[PDB]
Amino acid sequence: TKIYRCKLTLHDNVFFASREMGILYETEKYFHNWALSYAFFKGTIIPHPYGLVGQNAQTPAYLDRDREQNLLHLNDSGIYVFPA
RNA sequence: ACUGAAACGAUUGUUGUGCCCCUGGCGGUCGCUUUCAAUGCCU
């Protein structure tokens, strides 16, 4: 129902390790939706555990109801960010 | 797990070494301490 046109201005340099070739690591020119969804709603809606240990420390929880860092909380909040 | 979690292009290094503000130069030239004067007056 509501739609928000949000324009993002970088106030310091942004890095994502999108691809790697030798000494060079580089960032794709589109911000992925799921990265922005946690940037907007983690701590406010999605939980933000400061620590991890175990399999949970190197396995995503993107769409796993059994884990706290889900993007599915937002399906239930009725919210969806698009990619940038 | 935001293509995620942590993330020093760093460490060391003398703008250095030699160098005469040097050489030449007459404070010089001209200039009368000058001009006038009773050892005097009386015995």
From TrEMBL:
The lineage of its organism: Bacteria, Bacillati, Cyanobacteriota, Cyanophyceae, Synechococcales. Keywords: Plasmid. This is Slr7013 protein.
